Structure formats: C-alpha cells, structure tokens
Design a protein around this ligand. Structure first.
Ligand SMILES: C[C@H]1O[C@H](O[C@H]2[C@H](O)[C@@H](O)[C@@H](O[C@@H]3C(CO)=C[C@H](N[C@H]4[C@H](O)[C@@H](O)[C@@H](O[C@H]5[C@H](O)[C@@H](O)[C@@H](O[C@@H]6C(CO)=C[C@H](N[C@H]7[C@H](O)[C@@H](O)[C@@H](O[C@H]8[C@H](O)[C@@H](O)[C@@H](O[C@H]9[C@H](O)[C@@H](O)[C@H](O)O[C@@H]9CO)O[C@@H]8CO)O[C@@H]7C)[C@H](O)[C@H]6O)O[C@@H]5CO)O[C@@H]4C)[C@H](O)[C@H]3O)O[C@@H]2CO)[C@H](O)[C@@H](O)[C@@H]1O
Ligand SMILES: C[C@H]1O[C@H](O[C@H]2[C@H](O)[C@@H](O)[C@@H](O[C@H]3[C@H](O)[C@@H](O)[C@H](O)O[C@@H]3CO)O[C@@H]2CO)[C@H](O)[C@@H](O)[C@@H]1N[C@H]1C=C(CO)[C@@H](O)[C@H](O)[C@H]1O
Ligand code: GLC
Ligand code: GLC
Ligand code: CA
Ligand code: CA
Ligand code: CA
Ligand code: CA
Ligand code: NA
Length: 585
C-alpha cells in the first residue's frame, strides 16, 4: 500500500524560517509528483516557484522563502511505481524571528526538575545512555536549556546515599560527601563525582541558569554501626525495651574533611527498625521527644529520624547549608519532606543560610498537602517569608481533569490562586513521586498534560517547574518548547480572568507590558473531546491587534476590535486542546 511513512518537518511542527527543504518519505518508490502546492493558509496563497526532486521513495521540496509566524500547508498528489495514487498534506507553523524585547531583569523564571526515579535503570539505561553521567549531561545541555527558557535547574540530591551508586538520593547517608569520598561502595554518586558536579554548576552559571540542591534533612540511613538504645516509656512500640538501632555515623571514608561531626543515638529521636528482633515499628528513644511539626506526630517518616532539638545537630546542618551556597555555589534548595521536620528548625536554618550571603537564596519546600487551606496553614506555621512550597493543591485539579473537570474552576484552583500566597507557589504537573513506573504514590497526569503545562507556564503568579521525564523521556519537548516560548517572550504584564469560562473551556489573558511592543497572550485550554473547534469572545486588552496561535493548532488569525475583543479558538480534544494566541507583530 502507498502511504506517507514520515516527513521532515512532521505535520504540526514549528520550524525556523531558515528551513530550506521539506522531505516526504513514502512507503513505495515514487514515479511522479502529479500535484504540489505550498500554501500560506492565512492569505490563502500558493507560493510560486517551488521545486521538487524524487529520490526513490523520498520527495524533497524546496525553493521557497518561509515567512515568520505563518501557517503553511504542503499538499501533494503522488503516483508510485505500481500506479497507486495518493493525495495528502502536511501542515507546519514558522517561528517568530523578531520576539518582544523583555528587559533581562523582568524575564520570567522557569525551573527544570532535572531528574526522574528510573534514570539509568532498566530500559532507560539502554535507551538514554547519556543519563549514566547526569552532571556531565547537564553541563553539555546548559546552552540548550537556556535557549529553551529555563532559568533554574533542580538537581536530585547530590550527596552520598545509603544505596551508593544506586541511590536516587533520598536515602541520605552523608550530606558532606558530594561524590568525593569512598563511602557506600562508590566514590561517585549515581549522578557523578563532586568535580563533575562543580563543572555542571559552572557551565549552568555560564548560561545564566541557577542551580538548586535537593536537601534531605529529615533522616539518615546506612549507618556505619548500630547501638543499643533504650526506648522511652512514651514509645508507641516497645516502650521501655532495648533495641539495636542503626544510629552510628562516623563517615570513615571522609575522615573528617569539611566537618568533624559524628552522629550517634543522641542525635536521633527514633527509628523504625530493631536489629535484635528484626521487627519494624515506630520507636522513640529514651528521653527524646518528636519534634514540633505542623500536623501532630508527623516528625517520624523513615530511617533514623534526626533530632532537631539537639543543638550540635542543628549547628552541623546549618554549617552544611551555608557550605552548599557559599562554597559549592548553589543558588537555593528544595527541602524534601518539609512537613516532617521541626518547623522551628526549618525557619532557623533558612534564615541562617539566607543571612550568610548577599545572594538571595531560593527555598521551596515539599509539603505534600492537597488542600489549599492546609498548605496556607503550614506556611503560616513555619512563618519564614522566604519559604515557597510545591502547589500540590493545584495538581489535584489536574488529576480531576483526567476524566473531566469543571474547567471554569481553574480561576480559583491551587495555592497559586490564594490571595496573599500566590507568589509562594511553585507550580508543577508531575514529579518523581507522582509519575513513576512502579510504586507511584498517586496517578500521573497521563492525559491533558499539555493543558496543565500551558496553565502553569502562562500564569502571572508562581514559579513553574517542568519535569525532565515529560520533556526528554515521554518526548513532549516539541510541544513544551512552544509553551516555553510563550512564557519566555509573551507571558508578561497583568493577568486577567474572563467571564465566559464553562465546564469545558478555561481562558486567561496576559496583557503584556505597556512599554514592550508585541508581548501578551490569550490562553485557551479545554477538557472537551468532541473534536470540534470552539470559540470564545475575549478581551485581550490589546485593541486592533492581530494574533496567531503559536501552538500550530488553529490555522487562523484573530484580529481584535477597537475595545480589544476577539473570537479566540481552541480544538476540543485531549491531544490538541490548548491554544496560545500571541501578537503577530
Ligand atoms: C545490611 C545493612 O545494614 C545496615 O542498614 C540498616 C540501615 O542503616 C538502617 O537505616 C535501616 O534501614 C531501613 C531500611 C533498610 O532497607 C528501609 C526503610 N527505609 C526504606 C523506606 O521504607 C522505603 O519506602 C524506601 O524509601 C524511599 C521512598 O520509597 C522513595 O519514594 C523516596 O522517598 C522520598 C522521600 C524520603 O526522603 C520524601 C519525599 N516525598 C514524600 C513526602 O515528603 C511525604 O510527606 C509522603 O507524602 C505523603 C503525604 O505526607 C500524605 O499525606 C499522603 O498525601 C495525601 C495528602 O496529604 C492529602 O491532602 C491528599 O488528599 O491525599 C494524599 C495522598 O497522596 O501521601 C503522600 C504520599 O505517600 O511521602 C512522599 C513520597 C521525596 O520526594 C521522596 O522521593 O526515597 C526513599 C528513600 O530511598 O526506601 C527506604 C530505604 C527503613 O525506614 C530504614 O530505617 O535498617 C538497615 C538494616 O535493615 C547498615 O547500615 C548497612 O551498612 C548494611 O548494608
Ligand atoms: C505520552 C504520555 O507520556 C506520559 O504518560 C505515561 C504515564 O505518565 C505513565 O504512568 C504510563 O501511563 C499509564 C498509566 O500509568 C495508567 O494509569 C493508564 O491506565 O495507562 C497508561 C498507559 O501506559 O505511561 C505513559 C506513557 O506511555 C505522560 O504522563 C502523559 O501525559 C503523556 N501524554 C501527553 C501526550 C500526548 C500525545 O500527544 C497527549 O495526547 C496527552 O493528552 C498528553 O497528556
Ligand atoms: O564511635 C565509633 C565506634 O564506636 C563503637 O563502639 C562502634 O561499635 C564502632 O563500630 C565505632 O567505630
Ligand atoms: O507538633 C507536632 C507534635 O507532634 C509530636 O507529638 C511532638 O512531640 C509534639 O510536641 C509536637 O507538637
Ligand atoms: Ca522528622
Ligand atoms: Ca526531638
Ligand atoms: Ca469539563
Ligand atoms: Ca505590550
Ligand atoms: Na525528630
């Protein structure tokens, strides 16, 4: 049978105006190109003078000059060497060549989460062998990340873990070992050596990208030795019994470099394992008490739980934080498991790290709380103005969207829409805990993920985060790059809600800056599935302005009236139900 196998560009692509040829690859050798047209779809004009050449089953089309922002269709009728006839087309959109000029200081911030759970395991190791040396890879990719519009990267925990080269990083053994010391069976971490990390940091900084460390302060695992420890009469399990606890940490590979501190049972509140009875439990050590947490009795999670009421422990961990920023040159932190760490300590540590340098250190906590009011309460309780948090509440709306949501409610969803707290939201769609292959803790955003990204990337509040697995592994880069273009160049000025959202369509307006030519956008997203194009009458805040859809989805322009209104459009499908309208000029 005669069909098109592939094309370069693929249908629906955004391409540079510098593109010189279109390649069509057919299933059979081609005898004739009967008909061929490259049509500018906005003006409905066929481009004169295009040429083609046949090479076996390939047709190469060239001799054209593409116009930035224009939507094109290449239509063909071919005849193969068996006399089969095939009529078809591809469509593509040309990138803008002259973008709005946003002052460097006002450019939007966007984070890349630069890892996932299964990196360099199983089939991912075979298919993406470059990920066997993540720090080297990030150094190699820094220019492309910067070009894409990322301004910060969140690294996986970069210190040594209990599982050595296999640890994703959360099995914290030694904070002071960044892949420098022979500990846990390896000198490097999963990601590389300390020197490779420092090379990555310097390469990322060379491209004006900030670097955040994933700090895991709650627990320690992989103790060097076990101790006999009496449990408190207040212990939930085995009160008043001796257990054998893995609480001895002396870091013999490191041999005291950077910090002479060593850990024993007096540095921990408790543990979940007794090596005598070989029984799990929740064991509180004699004379210890669980630290103050937002929710009652949430200090214990796993491992040997750090006692942040111990002053020597506090001092070492504060020293470590200061080291990471001032000596290792990080720009901020993700605080893992933040709700399980003494809130007094979190506040004191943050302020001590912030106060140690003139650099404005970024902090985001992972407080897995899906109710907005509960998450506001958490923030209120830690009381540190610099603490941002991941917007798990907003992500709950994306989970709703999987089988259909009431889309107008995106006006009010999430911490990012909570008055007084919007600027402390770090918005996201998935991460290494919500999108993993096995042993995920929730369902992933397996449908309508683009819509979710479009929503967080165009918003005037919050700092959005892109997940490496989505961008590089699930191969959503091509679509995400369009959204990142929107954010980098267009998503500026105040944000406005609209008055005609409904069950299936949410729209949103960024007016642009009054002193920047050509910025601003109209977002339309939908959870509809009827497969039709739908419109909404929206006030763009840009009178008498022509807009185009930078996603390539709608092959029309919208020209607003003297009051700024136009009929902006979106396709009602899962796959293509987002559009971002931006000025043509
Ligand atoms: C031979 C050997 O001998 C010695 O070794 C000894 C060791 O030294 C000892 O330390 C000890 O070791 C013990 C061992 C040994 O195997 C195991 C065990 N530890 C396991 C652990 O049990 C296991 O699970 C796993 O842990 C990893 C985890 O699975 C991964 O996912 C990852 O995690 C991290 C992380 C931890 O750092 C935290 C982050 N995310 C958390 C989040 O922070 C947290 O709050 C929670 O979220 C829940 C919400 O809190 C909850 O509310 C709910 O959410 C609801 C929401 O609130 C509502 O609003 C809404 O409506 O509903 C929501 C529902 O979704 O649910 C969420 C989700 O659950 O969890 C999330 C995930 C971070 O992002 C995560 O990625 O990493 C973990 C660590 O790798 O593995 C470890 C190892 C014991 O604890 C440990 O003590 O004993 C051995 C001897 O056996 C000697 O030392 C050695 O030298 C010798 O070789
Ligand atoms: C392309 C696709 O990639 C990712 O999807 C992953 C899931 O994250 C992962 O859990 C697994 O999904 C299974 C899921 O766990 C299970 O609950 C369900 O019953 O079956 C799923 C199929 O195996 O694997 C898929 C990858 O195969 C992203 O999370 C998805 O969002 C992403 N979809 C994108 C891409 C397209 C294609 O253009 C859009 O049509 C789609 O709406 C968009 O969300
Ligand atoms: O304090 C360090 C030492 O104390 C102990 O008694 C431990 O059993 C031993 O393994 C450890 O090296
Ligand atoms: O706030 C968290 C609560 O959990 C634990 O029970 C603590 O011991 C208690 O002091 C703390 O306030
Ligand atoms: Ca704790
Ligand atoms: Ca304590
Ligand atoms: Ca709906
Ligand atoms: Ca403007
Ligand atoms: Na504790």
């Amino acid at each position: 049978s005669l069909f098109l196998i592939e094309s370069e560009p693929s249908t629906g692509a955004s391409v540079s105006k510098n593109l010189t040829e279109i390649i069509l690859i057919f299933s059979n050798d081609i005898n004739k190109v009967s008909q061929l047209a490259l049509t500018d779809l906005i003006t409905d004009s066929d481009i004169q003078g295009i040429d083609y050449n046949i090479e076996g089953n390939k047709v190469i089309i060239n001799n054209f000059s593409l116009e930035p922002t224009c939507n094109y269709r290449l239509s063909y009728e071919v005849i193969d060497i068996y006399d089969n006839h095939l009529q078809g087309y591809i469509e593509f959109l040309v990138n803008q060549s002259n973008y709005p000029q946003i002052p460097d200081q006002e450019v939007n911030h966007t984070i890349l989460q630069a890892f996932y759970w299964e990196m360099n395991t199983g089939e991912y190791a075979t298919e993406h062998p470059e990920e066997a040396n993540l720090w080297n890879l990030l150094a190699e990719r820094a220019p492309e990340l910067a070009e894409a519009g990322f301004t910060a990267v969140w690294l996986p925990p970069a210190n040594k873990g209990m599982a050595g080269i296999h640890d994703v990083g959360y099995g914290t053994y030694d904070l002071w070992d960044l892949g420098e010391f022979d500990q846990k069976g390896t000198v490097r971490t999963k990601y590389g050596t300390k020197g490779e990390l420092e090379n990555a940091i310097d390469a990322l900084h060379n491209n004006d990208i900030k670097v955040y460390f994933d700090a895991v302060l709650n627990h320690r695992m992989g103790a060097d030795y076990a101790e006999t420890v009496l449990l408190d009469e207040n212990s939930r399990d085995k009160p008043g019994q001796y257990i054998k606890a893995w609480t001895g940490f002396n870091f013999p590979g490191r041999n005291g470099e950077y910090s002479n501190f060593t850990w024993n049972g007096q540095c921990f509140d408790g543990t979940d394992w007794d090596d005598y009875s070989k029984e799990s439990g929740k064991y509180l050590f004699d004379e210890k008490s669980w630290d103050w947490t937002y929710n009652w009795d949430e200090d214990y999670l796993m491992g040997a739980d750090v006692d942040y009421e111990n002053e020597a422990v506090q001092n070492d961990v504060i020293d470590w934080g200061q080291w990471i920023i001032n000596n290792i040159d990080f720009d901020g932190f993700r605080l893992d498991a933040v709700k399980h760490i003494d809130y007094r300590f979190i506040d004191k540590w943050m302020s001590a790290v912030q106060n140690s340098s003139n650099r404005d250190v970024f902090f985001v906590g992972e407080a897995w709380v899906e109710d907005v009011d509960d998450l506001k309460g958490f923030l209120d309780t830690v009381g540190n103005p610099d603490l941002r948090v991941f917007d798990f509440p907003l992500r709950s709306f994306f989970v709703d969207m999987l089988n259909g949501a009431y889309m107008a409610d995106l006006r009010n969803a999430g911490l990012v829409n909570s008055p007084g707290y919007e600027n402390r939201a770090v918005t996201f769609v998935d991460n290494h805990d919500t999108d993993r292959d096995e042993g995920s803790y929730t369902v992933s955003i397996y449908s309508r993920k683009y819509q979710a990204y479009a929503y967080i990337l165009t918003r005037a509040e919050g700092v959005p985060t892109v997940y490496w697995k989505d961008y590089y592994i699930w191969e959503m880069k091509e679509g995400l790059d369009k959204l990142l273009t929107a954010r980098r160049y267009y998503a500026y000025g105040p944000g406005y809600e609209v008055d005609n959202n409904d069950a299936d369509i949410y729209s949103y307006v960024r007016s642009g800056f009054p002193d920047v030519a050509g910025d601003g956008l109209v977002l339309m997203i939908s959870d509809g599935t009827s497969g039709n194009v739908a419109g909404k009458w929206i006030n763009s805040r840009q009178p008498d302005t022509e807009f185009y859809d930078l996603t390539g989805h709608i092959k029309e322009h919208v020209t607003t009236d003297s009051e700024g209104y136009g009929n902006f459009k979106v396709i009602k499908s899962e796959d293509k139900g987002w559009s971002i309208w931006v000025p043509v000029e």
